[PDB]
Amino acid sequence: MENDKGQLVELYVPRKCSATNRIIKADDHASVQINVAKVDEEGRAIPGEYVTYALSGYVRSRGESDDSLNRLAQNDGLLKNVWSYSR
Amino acid sequence: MRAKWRKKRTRRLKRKRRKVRARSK
Amino acid sequence: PKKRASNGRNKKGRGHVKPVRCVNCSKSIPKDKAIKRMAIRNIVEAAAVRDLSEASVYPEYALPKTYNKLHYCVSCAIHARIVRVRSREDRKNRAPP
Amino acid sequence: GRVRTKTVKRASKALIERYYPKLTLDFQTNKRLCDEIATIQSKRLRNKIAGYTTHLMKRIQKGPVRGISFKLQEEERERKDQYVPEVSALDLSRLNVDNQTSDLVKSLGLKLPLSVINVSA
Amino acid sequence: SLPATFDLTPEDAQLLLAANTHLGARNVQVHQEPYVFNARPDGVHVINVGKTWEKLVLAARIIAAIPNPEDVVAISSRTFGQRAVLKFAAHTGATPIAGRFTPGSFTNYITRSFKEPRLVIVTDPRSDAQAIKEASYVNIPVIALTDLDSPSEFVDVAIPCNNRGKHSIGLIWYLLAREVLRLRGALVDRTQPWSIMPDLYFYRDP
Amino acid sequence: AKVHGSLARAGKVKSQTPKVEKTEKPKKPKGRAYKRLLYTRRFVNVTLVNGKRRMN
Amino acid sequence: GKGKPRGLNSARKLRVHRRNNRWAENNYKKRLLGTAFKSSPFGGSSHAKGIVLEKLGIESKQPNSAIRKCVRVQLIKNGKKVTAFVPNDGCLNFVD
Amino acid sequence: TRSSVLADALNAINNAEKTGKRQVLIRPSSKVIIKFLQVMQKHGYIGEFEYIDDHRSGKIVVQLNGRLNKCGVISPRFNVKIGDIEKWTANLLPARQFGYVILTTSAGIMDHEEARRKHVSGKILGFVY
Amino acid sequence: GWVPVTKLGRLVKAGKITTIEEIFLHSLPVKEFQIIDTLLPGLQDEVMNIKPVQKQTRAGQRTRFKAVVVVGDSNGHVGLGIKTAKEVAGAIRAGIIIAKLSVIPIRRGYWGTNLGQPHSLATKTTGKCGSVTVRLIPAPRGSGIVASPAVKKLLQLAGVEDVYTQSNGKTRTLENTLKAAFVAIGNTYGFLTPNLWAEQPLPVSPLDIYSDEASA
RNA sequence: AGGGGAUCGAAGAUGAUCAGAUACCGUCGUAGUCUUAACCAUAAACUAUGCCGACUAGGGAUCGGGUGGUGUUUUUUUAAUGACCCACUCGGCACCUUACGAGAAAUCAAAGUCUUUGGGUUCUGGGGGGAGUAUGGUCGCAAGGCUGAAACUUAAAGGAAUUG
C-alpha cells in the first residue's frame, strides 16, 4: 500500500500461496517454495532460470498439496494429462 | 454429611411443624 | 469428570437392560455392564484323564466337558484377579489378550 | 557380570573413530600402543579400554558395525554395494501382464510386445 | 514444455511392468490418489504407469534445479531401500540417510547429524513419518514414493508406485537417478540405453 | 462471640511511647517554587542513586 | 440460534426476559425491594446519631488476638441497638 | 426448518472458502442470492458463478478465489437510516478503506458506500470483506 | 567471535543478506540470535515480570524463575520470549535469546485518508492464548495506545502508536495476555486486503541465488 | 379396595463379631414383590449435551429397504426364488484416525462454521451458605408434588489438569 502520494509504504510485501491465494506469513514454517528447472530442446537443465511454485503450510497440512501442484504444473504446460478437471 | 439424609431429616421435621401446628387451627 | 465414553457399559439406544445377578455376591448388575466370562473345562480335569480312562468301560468314549457362563459385578470381578486395572492409554483397548 | 560401562565403551569407540589405519586385532598390540596415544590415569582402565577395542576389531572386519563411522569405512562404497549379488543378477528382465494390465498399455498408446494371458482363477 | 522425447519409451515400459510397479495397494484407497486405473478384480488396483512417468520426470526436474547436489537428502528407513538410496548418493550429490533417522536432525544444530537440506526424498512416507514431520518445521519440500494408500500429509510431488515389491522400490530409485544424470548432462546421449544394469539398486537377502 | 474482656489496657502503647518534639527546619517553598525544587533534585541531580536510585 | 429470540418483532420477549433475570443481581434486587429502608438500622442515610449505652470488649476473629473496644449505641430516630467501633489508638476513654 | 435461504448460501461459501476449495454448490438459489452475489462479483470477491436450472428452485455453482475473508447475512434485516449506516460499518468491517455492508434499499440491492452516493438507505442484508 | 553454524548465519555474516526483510519474505527459519541483532542493532529489551514456579519434590519444593521478556525496535518489529531457569539472572539472559528468535513484522496502516508514515493498524486483528482474547482496533491520529500498561509496553515496542484494545477472559495472567497480544500483532500480515490483490513474481530465495557460500 | 401370596424380603425376632454393633455376616420373617380398578407425578427420569434447518475430513463394520452384476450355493444340473459374495444408494444404533476448528482442560465430526461476534425458536443460571427452608396459594386419601423468599452469615466455595 501507499500513502497519499508515492514513496511506497508497507515494507515486506509478502508472498502468496499458488494453490489457495493466501498470504504466507513469516511464521509459516510449513510452507515451501517448489523449485523446478526446465530444459531447452536438448533435455539438459539450464541453471539460473527456474519455474517457481509457492505452497502455503495449510495446503500441505491437508496433504492436498500434491493434487494442487498437479494442476498448477499442467497449466504451465511442464506436465502432462496426469490431472483432469472433472473427477 | 449426606444430602440424602438431610432431605430425609428435613422431611421428618416437616411432619412435626405440620402436626404441632394442627393443634392450633 | 468423564472417565469412559461408554462410561461403564454397552447401553447406546436401549435405556434399560433388565439386569442380571452376580455369581460371587449376587449383586444386581445390568447385562450390558456385566463382565461375562465363559468357563469351559473338562468334567474331570486336564491331568486326571488317565485314571478315569484307565478304569473306563466304553473306551475313550467322549471325555465330555462342562459349559457355563459366569457374570460378575465390577467389585467382584476386580477382586478376583480379572480385568483389574489398566493405564489411561490402555483403557481404550478393547481387544482380548 | 563383566558388563563394561560407558566410560570404557565410549573411549574405545573414540579410539576406533580415528585410529583404524592403526592398532590391530591383538590385545597385546592394542594394549602397548594405547598407553601413549591416550593418557589414561589408571593401568586397570587402559587394560579395560584395550580389551574392549580388541573385541571391537573382531566385529568391524566381519561385517559393518552400526554406530562406528571412522575416517575410512565409508569407502567400502565400491566393493560391497556394487558387484550385483555373487554371480547372479546378470539378467533380471528377460509379457506376463494380466488381462487388466493389457488395456493400460494400449490406453497409453505405445506398442509394447505383450503375451497377455487371462488370469486364471 | 517438453521436447516430446521425455514421453514414455517402449523399453522403459516393460521395466516398469516387470518390476510390478503397476500393481499397487489393495482395495484400501486414500482419496488423495486419483492415479488408479481400472482396478483389477481380486482386490488389486493397477496404478497408471503412464502417470507415474510424468511425476517421475517432474521430480527429476526438481532435483536438477537444486544448485548444490549435496543439498538433496534421500531418506529410506524401509528395509527395501537402503541400498537404493546409497547408489543414488554415489551417482549424484544426494547425501543419504539409511536406517534410523536420528530425530531432530533438522533442528538443534548441536546434534552430530544436523542436516539442513533444500529438498528431501523419502521412500515410504508412512515408515518415514518422522522424517517428513521435521521437514514441515523448517520449510523443506518433500518427494515421496507414494503408494495408492500412503499418508500423503505434508507431501509435495509424489511418484505413484508400488512399495510392496523389492524391485519396484529399487527400480524407481534407479529411474529417479537416471534423468537427474541426463538433465545435469552427465549422460551425453539422451537416447542412450545406459546399459549399466538396474540390478545395482536391488536389496540382497544375505 | 464473647463480648467481655479487659478495658484496663485501652491506649496502653499510646501513653508508654516517649514524647519527641518537632525538629526545627527552614520552611519549604510552597506552590510553583516547590515544582522547581522537585524538578532539579530528581531530574538533574543523581545524588540519591544508592543502589536503585534510592531517595530514602 | 443461541438461545434468545432474534425476530424483528420480538422486543416484548426480550424486554420481559431481562426483567425476570434482573432480580438475580444482588444490587438490583436490594434497591427495588427497599431493604435499606425497612432494615439496616439507618434510614438509608450516611450517618445517624445515637446514645452510648455500654462499653464493649469484643474479641477478634482468628487468626487475631485483640480487644476491639466497641460501644453499644441506640439510634435516636429508630430506637434500635447497634454496635459501633471506636477507631483510633485508645479513644475509648472519650466515650465514657 | 429452513428459515433464511440467504444464510445457508452465505454459510456454504464461508466453509468452502475457509478450506481453500475454489467452488461451492448453492441451494436453493433465490433471487436475493443472485443480487447479493453480483455485488460481491462487482468488487472481484467471487468471480464466476453459474445458475443451474432444475425446475424446482435452481442451484448456483460459484467459483471461489482466495480473495474473500468473510461474507455474512445480518438477521433480522434491521431498518437502517442514513445516519445509522455509519454505525453498522464501524461495528462489522475491519477498516474504513475496504469492505462493504450490503443492504437492500428501495432502489434495488446495493452496498453501503454506493448507497451513500445515491443518498438512499433501507434494510440491512449482510456484509462482504 | 560468532563462527555461525547454519545456512542463514554464514549468509548474514558474509553480508550477503543486508536486510531482515529477506528473512521474513521467504519465511526463512532462524536458529541463532546473532542474526537478529546483526540485522537489527537497535532493538531494546524489557523484562515484564518474574514469577517463581514450584514443583513438589522429596524436599519441600524447588524454585525456578519464569522470566518474560519483550524485545523489538520501535519500528515494525517485535519479539516475545518466555523462558524458565533455576536462577533469576539466567532466565532473563535465556529469555533474551528466545525473544530475539521470535521477532516478527507488524502491519502499520492508517485509520483513514492516508497522509504519511502509517500510524495505526490496517485491520482489526485478534489473538488468543488460553482463555484470554486480545483484540486491536485501528484508532485515529493522536489517540495513543488504549491498553493496559503491560500490553501497551509490548504494543509501543512494536511501533504502533494509535490503537484500541478490548481484552477478554482472565487477563490477570500476564503470559496468556502477552502471548495473546503477540498473536494479535502477528495476524496483521495474515489479513489479505484489496491493497494486496496484485500478482507477484515469486522471488527466488537467497539460499539458491547465493548457494555458493554454504558450510562446505 | 378385591384376588394371589412360591421365591426374595424395608420392619421385627434371633446367632455371631465387636470396647459398644438395634450395622455389615447367618437363620427366620410381616408390608412389599404379581394381578385387577384407582391414586401418586418423582430418579444420577444421564448422552449430566433442547428441538428444527444448512454446511465442514477420511475409514471400515453392522441393521432395515432398494438397485445392478452371464457371481456362489440349494429346488427340477437348470429357473422365479431363499441364504451368501461384490458394487452403489437411502435411513439408523454406533465405532476408528486426525485436527483446518473448538475448548480452561478433560475432551469434542460436534461440545465445529462464536470478538472476522446475527439461520429459527423454547427453557434455565448470575459467588458460597441460610434454602428448595419459612409463609401464602394449588394439587394429593396420605406420603408429598408444583410455585417460592427474607433476616442473617461468609472470602472464598467450585471446575480441569500437574508434581508430590
Numbering used by the authors:
A (entry chain AV): 1 to 87
B (entry chain Bm): 1 to 25
C (entry chain Aa): 2 to 98
D (entry chain AR): 2 to 95, 100 to 126
E (entry chain AA): 2 to 207
F (entry chain Ae): 2 to 57
G (entry chain AX): 2 to 97
H (entry chain AW): 2 to 130
Reproduce passages from the article.
Also here, density for RQT was present on 80S monosomes, but contrary to the pre-splitting situation, we found these 80S ribosomes and their associated RQT in two different conformations: the classical POST-state of the lead ribosome (termed C1) and a state termed C2 in which the 40S head was swiveled by 20 degrees relative to the 40S body and RQT was repositioned on the 40S. In the C2 state, the 80S ribosome adopted a conformation very similar to a (mRNA/tRNA) translocation intermediate (TI) as described in a recent study analyzing eEF2-bound POST-states. Yet, the 40S head in C2 has undergone a large counterclockwise swivel motion of 20 degrees, resembling essentially the TI-POST-2 state stabilized by eEF2. The RQT in the head-swiveled TI-POST-2 state (C2) showed the same inter-cassette arrangement as in C1, indicating that RQT accompanies the swivel movement (rotation) of the 40S head essentially as a rigid body. It undergoes only a small additional rotation towards the beak of the 40S head by about 10 degrees around its binding site on uS3. As a consequence, whereas the main contacts to the 40S head via uS3 and the Slh1 FN3/HhH remain fully intact, the Slh1 NTC relocates on the body of the 40S subunit, with the trajectory of the 40S head swivel corresponding to a downwards movement of the NTC RecA domains of Slh1 along rRNA h16. The RecA2 domain thereby translocates from near the tip of h16 towards its stem. In this position, an additional contact with h16 is formed by the FN3 domain that basically occupies the position of the HhH domain on h16 in the C1 state. In turn, the HhH forms a rRNA contact with h18 at a position that is occupied by the C-terminal tail of eS30 in the C1 state. Notably, C2 states were neither present in splitting-incompetent reactions including an ATPase-deficient Walker A mutation in the NTC of Slh1(K316R-RQT) nor in reactions with disomes lacking the 3′-mRNA overhang.
Ribosome-associated quality control facilitates the degradation of incomplete translation products and requires dissociation of the stalled ribosomes. A central event is therefore the splitting of collided ribosomes by the ribosome quality control trigger complex, RQT, by an unknown mechanism. The RQT complex of yeast is composed of the ATP-dependent Ski2-like RNA helicase Slh1 (Rqt2), the ubiquitin-binding CUE domain containing protein Cue3 (Rqt3) and the zinc-finger containing protein Rqt4. We propose that the Ski2-like helicase 1 (Slh1) subunit of RQT applies a pulling force on the mRNA, causing destabilizing conformational changes of the small ribosomal subunit, ultimately resulting in subunit dissociation.
